[PDB]
Design a protein around this nucleic acid. Structure first.
Ligand SMILES: C[C@@]1(F)[C@H](O)[C@@H](COP(=O)(O)OP(=O)(O)O)O[C@H]1n1ccc(=O)[nH]c1=O
Ligand SMILES: [Cl-]
Ligand SMILES: [Mn+2]
Ligand SMILES: [Mn+2]
Ligand SMILES: [Mn+2]
Length: 535
RNA sequence: AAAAUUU
RNA sequence: AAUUU
């Protein structure tokens, strides 16, 4: 029936110039050697991406879908949710959000400039006066950085971003933000994945696994999920939004946004030309995560019931999920997962890689991460969250005139502090760099390097500084990724760390704490690391 | 471009 | 600001 896109033939123009790396990457040329592998997806590649995501959809629902959907509205109606004052919505706008076509940008919106506020008022009138006229959208390519992978293609084509003018974005917020805050949690309960910390993901997954007499797990992801979303799916999304308690004024705006923005519309490139027309999810709308998550959750629970999955326990973050089920023997488990996949495909959410049942928690990847295990100080098992380091290390090497990766380094250090690759590689480099710069004191992205031991303990527990005997998988994968990027192997990082440490210690102060906590793995005679007053 | 988490 | 979807 519905085609996901149609294309005029107009280019997908760049929204400003997309920078090149330089001949010298001074911050990262001691991190790794193979900078030729580190690239940023350009708008040149956008054409290819479109070809991949433009395709015909044929949804076919059934009793299981219909029944799940029913249950989800009886959930929805316990939610009452309100409008957001034009002002409050303006306040929620990000500081650097792309400026409006009508001569104002996010400074003005957040500072409640008069021109901005009027224009927004008029936009919201038109939403109320008019529930059919399609709202124009802009289409741009996303700039992510990756390592090349000649296994899976050379270089990925750029993801497509589709969004309305800033005025419309504010209005969306007025109508829906409150919903986004309440609905999913209400509908999916514990299954709603974006509620949890990394640590709670891990505990949740473990509680799940442990509760089964004979657990079986698997993950699923949908291929180009946004383009698999059907006009109908979106309307079904609306009909769930509506199922709450709502100011009549909302309903009108929601319904109006649904029909004018969410189910489709014309797309324009940055140069102004008509680019195509869209009949699936737009990436750049307020409802994207909520939508994806809810919709994916419906289809998945339906597919679960179709396929026979016993005692499923789910976790959903957008198009990504994990189900931990009672195993029905491998012969049947293989059969049920085929069924699941057929069902999902009938619902128009077919997978990239077909899923597979697994019976070891380390072998289930989702949202690009997984659970692994190591031993802590007293010799007990410690489960934690990790991931292939390839991309993090690639992004660690993205240095241009505009961009510096030092923030990225730190970002990953915090999120993945217990991982062997953060502890041995990133930390070591990060500190080594700042000691030489002599810029330990400086707060980066509103965080101070010398707090780190505190911040990590607060978040990952003290065992994060004492962990050892990492898993085969994890050692194999780290080593492999360092070779791939032309980085020194771990033995070399051991050396560099020892040096960084001694130097950190000798400097004394909050420094020497860092030296002693963060790098205790690096030394022959370990130390009695005790809790830190701060967290 | 949007959200969530982390800070 | 970091990461993810
Ligand atoms: C565009 C999506 F709908 C996308 O289709 C969906 C699923 O994410 P995934 O990373 O699996 O990518 P695809 O499924 O290939 O789109 O999540 C949304 N998404 C993703 C990446 C992103 O920077 N922003 C975003 O809004
Ligand atoms: Cl322990
Ligand atoms: Mn996907
Ligand atoms: Mn309606
Ligand atoms: Mn995904």
């Amino acid at each position: 029936s519905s085609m996901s896109y149609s294309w005029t033939g107009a280019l997908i123009t760049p929204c400003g110039p997309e920078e090149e790396k330089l001949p010298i990457n001074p911050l990262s040329n001691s991190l790794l050697r193979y900078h030729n592998k580190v690239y940023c997806t350009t708008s040149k590649s956008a054409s290819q991406r479109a070809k991949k995501v433009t395709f015909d959809r044929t949804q076919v629902l059934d009793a299981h879908y219909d029944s799940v959907l029913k249950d989800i509205k009886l959930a929805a109606s316990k939610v009452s949710a309100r409008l957001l004052t034009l002002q409050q919505a303006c306040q929620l706008t990000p500081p650097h959000s792309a400026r409006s076509k009508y001569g104002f940008g996010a400074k003005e919106v957040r500072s409640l400039s008069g021109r901005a506020v009027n224009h927004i008022k008029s936009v919201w009138k038109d939403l109320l006066e008019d529930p059919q006229t399609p709202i124009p959208t802009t289409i741009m390519a996303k700039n992510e950085v990756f390592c090349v992978d000649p296994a899976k293609g050379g270089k990925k084509p750029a993801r497509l971003i589709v969004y309305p003018d800033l005025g419309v974005r504010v209005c969306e917020k007025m109508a829906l933000y409150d919903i986004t805050q309440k609905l999913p949690q209400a509908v999916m309960g514990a299954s709603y994945g974006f509620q949890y910390s990394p640590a709670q993901r891990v505990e949740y997954l473990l509680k799940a696994w442990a509760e089964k007499k004979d657990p079986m797990g698997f993950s699923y992801d949908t291929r180009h999920f946004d383009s698999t979303v059907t006009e109908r799916d979106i309307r079904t999304e609306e009909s769930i939004y509506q199922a709450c308690s709502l100011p009549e004024e909302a309903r009108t705006a929601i319904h109006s946004l649904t029909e004018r923005l969410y189910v489709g519309g014309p797309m324009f490139n940055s140069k102004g030309q008509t680019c195509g027309y869209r009949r699936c999810r737009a990436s750049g709308v307020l409802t994207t995560s909520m939508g994806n998550t809810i919709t994916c959750y419906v289809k998945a629970l339906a597919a679960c019931k179709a396929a026979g999955i016993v005692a499923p326990t789910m976790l959903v973050c957008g198009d990504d999920l994990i189900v931990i089920s009672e195993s029905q023997g491998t012969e049947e488990d293989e059969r049920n997962l085929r069924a699941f996949t057929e069902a999902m495909t009938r619902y128009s959410a077919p997978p990239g890689d077909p899923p597979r049942p697994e019976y070891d928690l380390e072998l289930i990847t989702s949202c690009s991460s997984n659970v692994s295990v190591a031993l802590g100080p007293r010799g007990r098992r410690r489960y934690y969250l990790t991931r292939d380091p390839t991309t993090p290390l690639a992004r660690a090497a993205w240095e241009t005139v505009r961009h510096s990766p030092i923030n990225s380094w730190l970002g990953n250090i915090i999120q993945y502090a217990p991982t062997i690759w953060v502890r041995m590689v990133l930390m070591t480099h990060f500190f080594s760099i700042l000691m030489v710069q002599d810029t330990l004191d400086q707060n980066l992205g509103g965080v101070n390097p010398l707090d780190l031991p505190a911040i990590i303990e607060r978040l990952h527990g003290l065992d994060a500084f004492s962990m050892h005997t990492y898993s085969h998988h994890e050692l194999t994968r780290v080593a492999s990724a360092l070779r791939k990027l032309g980085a020194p192997p771990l033995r070399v990082w051991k050396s560099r760390a020892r040096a960084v440490r001694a130097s950190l210690i000798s400097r004394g102060g909050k420094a020497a704490v860092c030296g002693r906590y963060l790098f205790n793995w690096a030394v022959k005679t370990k130390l009695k690391l005790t809790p830190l007053p701060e967290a």
